[model samples]
Target: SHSGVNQLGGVFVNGRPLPDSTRQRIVELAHSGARPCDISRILQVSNGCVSKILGRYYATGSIRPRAIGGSKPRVATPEVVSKIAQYKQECPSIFAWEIRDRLLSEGVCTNDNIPSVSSINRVLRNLASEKQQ
Candidate 1:
């Protein structure tokens, strides 16, 4: 049961075989005219997963569908990105998580909005692009 599974632990990766209840909810949400974004929020699934399910249903009316896991950018501010750029040049050996800690020390990232290690990488890459210009 979904309730059991939810109660236990873990997220359900999309495209894999979900329990009938979960699949049915996806179909129901689609039929009821909920937007994919809202459906993803309500169902606690990825937005891409919702898009795939809806696209699949539109083409074939199938509840069981595969998931497409692609991501779009969720960028941070130019200042923060610049900080990363400077930090990388000045402290190339600093790891992403450690940079996060330094940022924490600078009191730049409030408790709720801290960037993860991967986000740090994204910022660095963005800054690196600017450096070449």
Candidate 2:
């Protein structure tokens, strides 16, 4: 019921879950000897996604989406946070920018993927709160 038309007048939808009818169609197609890659092409989803769907169906006899709560995996890992903390403790008056610079210079992280200043400050603030408790 959440379906609508895009700016070009083509049909579209918001964030509605994939229709159960589509899953049934996939099951039927898969049972009819259609390859996962061929099914993915016809169904407009990734091959890996179709593979996982088949895997789940074979394992549980259900085509329902699995329970997948909680936030996504973080790019700024715990190791990065710990290194920032170590640098800050060694220099109590260190700035977030300085910490980033030192992390890059010390080869802790490369220029291509260093954590942002805001993330560093957030980790430091969380660390301080944890220590106070």
Candidate 3:
């Protein structure tokens, strides 16, 4: 099952959002004035997890785990995209590598910070489509 494996090939299917029953236990313990660190030590879970459960219960009256799924912000910022477009406009026949090299040489982006060739191509296509529209 895809449930027990991470993208990095590490096995980390445990201790993520404790079971609902355990969450209820945590809530009960917190209500009785038990310290979060003590509860965590007894339960063998992170103190942060214990505090989060209690805080969430008080804040939202729910112990359900927060949803987790979203795309990362684009690494190629608008400035980088505009730079790519500027290079393209300056030389209509410029290749992606040439544009990347030019940007690197001009100090627009360092070698380590420069966008990949595929990223440059994607930006070029996006710009072309945007201009057409």
Candidate 4:
């Protein structure tokens, strides 16, 4: 029953309503022709959720909303999910470097140090698939 929840701090995402400043920036970016996918990447939200929010915004010229989808996860992309899963499956002895290396080979780059080892494992364990677990 994973739906959508408002992400508080952190980078950014679609299911989560961004902070005022971030929301304003996203809207501006959206108006400027930033594709929803790019916006989600820039803001750290999911692409599917970005599409949903874009529709929501067009329907109502407001940033925040009365309510969003129910309380479940609308997370990462299918590719990321699968990659994470495969990484874990092939190398159960995981580490940030390993995740980073695998994702990097696939062209995904990020500077964030992987969270705790437990956190990484938690990520894999928590998700239904590889997407936004």
Candidate 5:
């Protein structure tokens, strides 16, 4: 619906989410009475993943993968963050979407390269943290 080729899109924030085969294996192992900590060693995944995956099962009753990549890091560079900070400083009430629009207006980045909506707010949040500290 969004685009064609399967070669690219968003990626997991975890660097990569484990495979369905791995997730399925977790469900199977749990049913077969494997310890969660031991599941980590057996699957070669993090203990957090062991806990997270199983918790997801108990919570949703689905081994289906959860949402992936909506929280992706921006493609923006250092200057972009600086500019965002500047914009954020210029107005106490500026919207992140407007900052995104400004980036396009000034040609700082084209549509293909500018950070996404969620991306801008995260930068803005980072800016807030900087001001606090």
Candidate 6:
């Protein structure tokens, strides 16, 4: 049911944020004056997880988790987007590959960060919505 599953190198780990019950357990354990490391070890969670929640409880005292969110960051950030628009403005006929090359040359976007041809086309279309031939 889309339960969290993250693949790391070769091991599989839970991708889901822990439930309220689990986080509550951490709070209960931590209150007894035990170390976060020990609490984490007992809970079988990462120490970082334990440490952050400890701060969270003391920081504002809510057991609710954060960030139930989004995709990897967009390859075409606004800077890259503006660069694309700049290229388009410079040469209305510029192809996506042409933009890709100029993007690399100008160091505005690295290889993986550059948008794909379709992405460029879609972006171009978006720009067109504002003003197009």
Global fold similarity of model 2 (TM-score): 0.46
Query: Residue 107 error for model 3, in Å?
Result: 0.8
lDDT of 4 by residue, 23-123 (tens): 67678889999988788877776666677667877888877856675573223345655677778788778775577566767664344532344544566
lDDT of 2 by residue, 30-81 (tens): 9999999778767765566678778889999999876555775264677788
lDDT of each residue in 17-100, candidate 1, tens digit only: 555676678779878988887787788766766787778777898876455566644445666666667677798998988888
Count clashing pairs, candidate 5: 0
Reference-based lDDT, residue 92, model 2: 94
The global Cα lDDT (0 to 1) of model 5 is 0.78
In the predicted model 4, the residue pairs found to clash are: 2-72, 3-72, 12-44, 13-45, 76-132, 81-130, 81-131
RMSD of 6: 8.1
lDDT of each: 0.70, 0.77, 0.77, 0.64, 0.78, 0.77
Give per-candidate clash totals.
Answer: 0, 0, 0, 7, 0, 1
* Candidate 1 lDDT for residue 7: 25
- Residue 131 of candidate 2: its Cα lDDT? 92
Worst 10 residues of 5 by lDDT: 1-10
TM-score of each: 0.41, 0.46, 0.46, 0.37, 0.43, 0.45
- For model 3, how big is the CA root-mean-square deviation? 8.3
Model 2, poorest ten-residue lDDT window?
A: 6-15
- Identify the runs in model 2 with alpha carbons over 4 angstroms from their true place: 1-73
Compose the digit string of candidate 6's lDDT tens values, residues 21-105: 7789999998887788788667776777778887988998998888766765487778888888999998998899898888889
Q: Candidate 3, which segments miss by more than 4 Å at Cα? A: 1-74
Flag the better candidate by TM-score, 2 or 6.
2
